[PDB]
Design a protein around this nucleic acid. Structure first.
Ligand SMILES: [Mg+2]
Ligand SMILES: [Mg+2]
Ligand SMILES: [Mg+2]
Ligand SMILES: [Mg+2]
Ligand SMILES: [Mg+2]
Ligand SMILES: [Mg+2]
Ligand SMILES: [Mg+2]
Ligand SMILES: [Mg+2]
Ligand SMILES: [Mg+2]
Ligand SMILES: [Mg+2]
Ligand SMILES: [Mg+2]
Ligand SMILES: [Mg+2]
Ligand SMILES: [Mg+2]
Ligand SMILES: [Mg+2]
Ligand SMILES: [Mg+2]
Ligand SMILES: [Mg+2]
Ligand SMILES: [Mg+2]
Ligand SMILES: [Mg+2]
Ligand SMILES: [Mg+2]
Ligand SMILES: [Mg+2]
Ligand SMILES: [Mg+2]
Ligand SMILES: [Mg+2]
Ligand SMILES: [Mg+2]
Ligand SMILES: [Mg+2]
Ligand SMILES: [Mg+2]
Ligand SMILES: [Mg+2]
Ligand SMILES: [Mg+2]
Ligand SMILES: [Mg+2]
Ligand SMILES: [Mg+2]
Ligand SMILES: [Mg+2]
Ligand SMILES: [Mg+2]
Ligand SMILES: [Mg+2]
Ligand SMILES: [Mg+2]
Ligand SMILES: [Mg+2]
Ligand SMILES: [Mg+2]
Ligand SMILES: [Mg+2]
Ligand SMILES: [Mg+2]
Ligand SMILES: [Mg+2]
Ligand SMILES: [Mg+2]
Ligand SMILES: [Mg+2]
Lengths: 25, 136, 64, 99, 215, 126, 84
RNA sequence: CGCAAGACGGACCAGAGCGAAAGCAUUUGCCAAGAAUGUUUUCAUUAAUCAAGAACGAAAGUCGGAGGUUCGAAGACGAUCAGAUACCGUCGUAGUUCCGACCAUAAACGAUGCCGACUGGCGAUGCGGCGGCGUUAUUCCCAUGACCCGCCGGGCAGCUUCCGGGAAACCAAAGUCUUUGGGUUCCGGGGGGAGUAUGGUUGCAAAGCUGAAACUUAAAGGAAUUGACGGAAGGGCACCACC
């Protein structure tokens, strides 16, 4: 299901980017 | 050959415990109490392919070998208790069930009372396979 | 494992069985006590009335 | 779009019904969606009755039956040809097929 | 055990039934005869024989299997005693069917003697002879009243009787025959069967009591 | 195989029968000549097929009437039965008789003679 | 639905088939009745849908039972519907 | 033949019941609650819908205890296959179970807000009430219980058709709409970027709520029709098909 898998991959990328932005700050 | 020292007027009864399943069949003759057993013959003793262990020919081959030993020792009649795999599983007698039972009649042995003895739950543990079932 | 031979007379032709329609369902009596009857799958061109020879008569045909 | 007025299920005025396992599939199908079938067959046979009614040590012995309640997948029942397709106008006939 | 054809080291016995049953010759069993430390009477006691009622009373139905426990051997003879009652799969399955109400009950009771019994009971509502509707469903209070009236009878008739006197009522099942009548002003209820009897607690042996059951 | 006749043969045979009903018999070798002389069939095979279906129809018209050919002899036996016959009489006995709630109805339109009664069990299927 | 029904002059019986309120003018289905205990002797006046237990005076110390609908008299003889 | 443990309440079980929804099925007792029906009881407009705010809220998941039978993410093997980190098989951790705190999301669906009025027919069905012959049980009895034949309230639904509507599929409501106005809350404005970035708030965490723009594009989409195709089903057929 491209919809929920798109959702999961975007959630993963957003979690990663937020954790990096918080760590380096 | 020693057996029950009367059989000319009355028969000597037994129980046959036919367990028929989609992987194999047993024929298993015990005394009238069930605790002391006599010859037990299984479909995989009578074929050399795993796929054939649950087949009517292996079933009647076993029923004949059982009836011969039964007649030879002391027994002339039988009661029948018929088993599917039962609770949590297939709950329906396998393919070998109808053939062993009639290969007892075609072999001299006399038949008594027939019952089904499949174990049935009042409600079960969880069945194998996950919620989407065995999909293949 | 030790059984004699049984001659059986055909009394009815039922249909053509097998993947290619290559064998025939046939009902037979047993030449000794006509009160017996079984169903077999025969390979050749069977009419009604022929006499088949059974090497194993305790079997019965299901299909195919 | 909407293929069945009842959504292909017997539920009306309920939130939930208890699931059950498809008898060969082990699937997980709602009790009022699954396809049920109650079979009542002779324990011995239809052909091999003579070989047993003759060997019985009882003169008048009635052979027992074997009652089984089967629950079926939708896919699993279509594949065993328990059910088939129907016309768009014939799907509305809900009578059991003539014996 | 792989002694020479170990069925040539076995001895056969007779299995006798209690004095109530018309037919008292159940059948035969075999046991390895006595050796240095394993006694035959021990390895022979405590066996259970499930016998149909037709094969014991000769005058009635084929269901209602009885269980008989071996108590003490006496010189090529086994003395059995009641151990429980049950029904056959086919009857119990042919009774449960759609568009009805099935009513079940169960009690635990003691027999003036030390036998503690665990009796179960079942019944089904009845389509009336002129009914036009399709279902014979009973309301909840009716089912509760029927269960109460069933338990009360199933205790009354076991608190007041010896173990032998109660088994004699289980043989033709008069208990169900009177529950069917008692529950007729609530809902017709065209079936009552004591579908099972369990043996929970039994007192010490007292062979004098066993030999009375065989005389 | 075949031996299924075509509409061109069946319609021809039906017309031949419906006009020359009294010249046709039960044998084939005479019906052949009759149809040869009364019609114009531009072939011999077609002539034989038409004359062979005519015989199979004639063998049936001797029994109950078929539903595609109308002749004179078989119409009289309808006509003379559609007019009244002594198998029928009047209303079979002119002392026909009723139940209550009909006498109660008849009373509301002034009737007063020659009837009976009965009362049933009080509802259906009892 | 005869398409020309008369609403102003309904049937004398089809206007007692309807609900107590859906009729042309409302009317209760209940009534008051004289009741006689066969023991003491008075003329107790009782509501048909009583919903209370009624006694006469002393004596029987019961005269009606309440139910989900019309009350039932024990053996109170001769009961008369009172009128308008 | 016995013993123990932890799960789970089959068949009866239905287009049936109950609850605001999520959900709810062994017996018995206790505790409080509830709709409908019956009423010639009582108060007398006390009502409908609702920013702020509030209670409950499947599964999965987080924290701390108890327990751990069965099943089983992750993981280890055996197969299948070019590969197979999958479908199949044998094990198996977290979890699945109970308690005390969180989280507030589901194709949470009748994809259909709530209150009220009007507009066809029919046969059933669960609850309450009313009327009426006859069967049936107890106590022979009156009561009553099981059936039978109707009527009335409101409930879950079904069949029917030129009420009427609609793009149609279909709908007695999705009707009473260019002959347009009974009351009221929420909410949409071509397809993507995107439920994204950013600010705020909540949470232990996972995450929930609120929520753009630059840029890009002539279509994306709905219902139905005719073909072609299907490792879809039914019936037939051909040595350019097989046996
Ligand atoms: Mg497993
Ligand atoms: Mg498949
Ligand atoms: Mg589709
Ligand atoms: Mg739901
Ligand atoms: Mg219910
Ligand atoms: Mg249960
Ligand atoms: Mg409100
Ligand atoms: Mg709000
Ligand atoms: Mg949860
Ligand atoms: Mg959880
Ligand atoms: Mg916490
Ligand atoms: Mg924990
Ligand atoms: Mg893995
Ligand atoms: Mg691997
Ligand atoms: Mg591949
Ligand atoms: Mg594949
Ligand atoms: Mg696996
Ligand atoms: Mg496992
Ligand atoms: Mg949550
Ligand atoms: Mg909250
Ligand atoms: Mg949402
Ligand atoms: Mg929604
Ligand atoms: Mg409305
Ligand atoms: Mg109704
Ligand atoms: Mg009623
Ligand atoms: Mg009444
Ligand atoms: Mg009642
Ligand atoms: Mg409701
Ligand atoms: Mg409706
Ligand atoms: Mg509406
Ligand atoms: Mg309006
Ligand atoms: Mg837009
Ligand atoms: Mg938003
Ligand atoms: Mg933020
Ligand atoms: Mg262009
Ligand atoms: Mg389309
Ligand atoms: Mg198309
Ligand atoms: Mg096909
Ligand atoms: Mg050919
Ligand atoms: Mg070839």
């Amino acid at each position: 299901m491209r919809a929920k898998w798109r959702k999961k991959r975007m959630r993963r990328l957003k979690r990663k980017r937020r954790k990096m932005r918080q760590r380096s700050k | 050959s020693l057996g029950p020292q009367v059989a000319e007027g009355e028969n000597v009864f037994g129980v046959c415990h036919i367990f028929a399943s989609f992987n194999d069949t047993f024929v298993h003759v015990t005394d009238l109490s069930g605790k002391e057993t006599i010859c037990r013959v299984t479909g995989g003793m009578k074929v050399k392919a795993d796929r054939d262990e649950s087949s009517p020919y292996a079933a009647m081959l076993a029923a004949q070998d059982v009836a011969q030993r039964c007649k030879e020792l002391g027994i002339t009649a039988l009661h029948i208790k018929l088993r599917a795999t039962g609770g949590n599983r297939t709950k329906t007698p396998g393919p070998g069930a109808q053939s062993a039972l009639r290969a007892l009649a075609r072999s001299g042995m006399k038949i008594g009372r027939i019952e089904d003895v499949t174990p049935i739950p009042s409600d079960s543990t969880r069945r194998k396979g996950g919620r989407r079932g065995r999909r293949l | 494992r030790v059984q004699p031979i049984k001659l059986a007379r055909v009394t009815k032709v039922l249909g053509r069985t097998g993947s290619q329609g290559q064998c025939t369902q046939v009902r037979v009596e047993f030449m000794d006590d006509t009160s017996r009857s079984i169903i077999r799958n025969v390979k050749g061109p069977v009419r009604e009335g022929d006499v088949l020879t059974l090497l194993e008569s305790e079997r019965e045909a299901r299909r195919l | 779009t909407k293929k069945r007025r009842n959504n292909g299920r017997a539920k009306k005025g309920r939130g939930h019904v208890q699931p059950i396992r498809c008898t060969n599939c082990a699937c997980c199908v709602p009790k009022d969606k699954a396809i049920k079938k109650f079979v009542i067959r002779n324990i011995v046979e239809a052909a091999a009755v003579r070989d047993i009614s003759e060997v019985s040590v009882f003169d008048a012995y009635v052979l027992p039956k074997l009652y089984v309640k089967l629950h079926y997948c939708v896919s699993c029942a279509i594949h065993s040809k328990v059910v088939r397709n129907r016309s768009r106008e014939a799907r509305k006939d809900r009578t059991p097929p003539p014996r | 055990k792989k002694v020479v054809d170990p069925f040539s080291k076995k001895d056969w016995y007779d299995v006798k039934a209690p004095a109530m049953f018309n037919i008292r010759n159940i059948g035969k069993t075999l046991v390895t005869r006595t050796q240095g430390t394993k006694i035959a009477s021990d390895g022979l006691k405590g066996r259970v024989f499930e016998v149909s009622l037709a094969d014991l009373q000769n005058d009635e139905v084929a269901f209602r299997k009885f269980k008989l426990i071996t108590e003490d051997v006496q010189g090529k003879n086994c003395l059995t005693n009641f151990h429980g009652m049950d029904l056959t799969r086919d009857k119990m399955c042919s009774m449960v069917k759609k568009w009805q109400t099935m009513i079940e009950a169960h009690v635990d009771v003691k027999t003036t003697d030390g036998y503690l019994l665990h009796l179960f009971c079942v019944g089904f509502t009845k389509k009336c002879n002129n009914q036009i509707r399709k279902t014979s469903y009973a309301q909840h209070q009716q089912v509760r009243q029927i269960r109460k009236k069933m338990m009360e009878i199933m205790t009354r008739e076991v608190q007041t009787n010896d173990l032998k006197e109660v088994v004699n009522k289980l043989i033709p099942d008069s208990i169900g025959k009177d529950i069917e009548k008692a529950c007729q002003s609530i809902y017709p209820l065209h079936d009552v069967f004591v579908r099972k009897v369990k043996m929970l607690k039994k007192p010490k042996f007292e062979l004098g009591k066993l030999m009375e059951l065989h005389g | 195989m075949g031996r299924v006749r075509t509409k061109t043969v069946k319609k021809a045979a039906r017309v031949i029968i419906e006009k020359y009903y009294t010249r046709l018999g039960n044998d084939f070798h005479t019906n052949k000549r009759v149809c040869e002389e009364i019609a114009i069939i531009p072939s011999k095979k077609l002539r034989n097929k038409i004359a062979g279906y005519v015989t199979h129809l004639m063998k049936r018209i001797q029994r109950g009437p078929v539903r595609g050919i109308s002749i004179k002899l078989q119409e009289e036996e309808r006509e003379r039965r559609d007019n009244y016959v002594p198998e029928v009489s009047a209303l079979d006995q002119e002392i026909i008789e009723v139940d209550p709630d009909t006498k109660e109805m008849l009373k509301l339109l002034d009737f007063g003679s020659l009837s009976n009664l009965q009362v049933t069990q009080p509802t259906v299927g009892m | 639905m005869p398409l020309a029904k008369d609403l102003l002059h309904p049937s004398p019986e089809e206007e007692k088939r309807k609900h107590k309120k859906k009729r042309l003018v409302q009317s209760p289905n209940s009534y008051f009745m004289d009741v006689k205990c066969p023991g003491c002797y008075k003329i107790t006046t009782v509501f048909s849908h009583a919903q209370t237990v009624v006694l006469c005076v002393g004596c029987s110390t019961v005269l009606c039972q309440p139910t989900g609908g019309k009350a039932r008299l024990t053996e109170g003889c001769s009961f008369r519907r009172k009128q308008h």
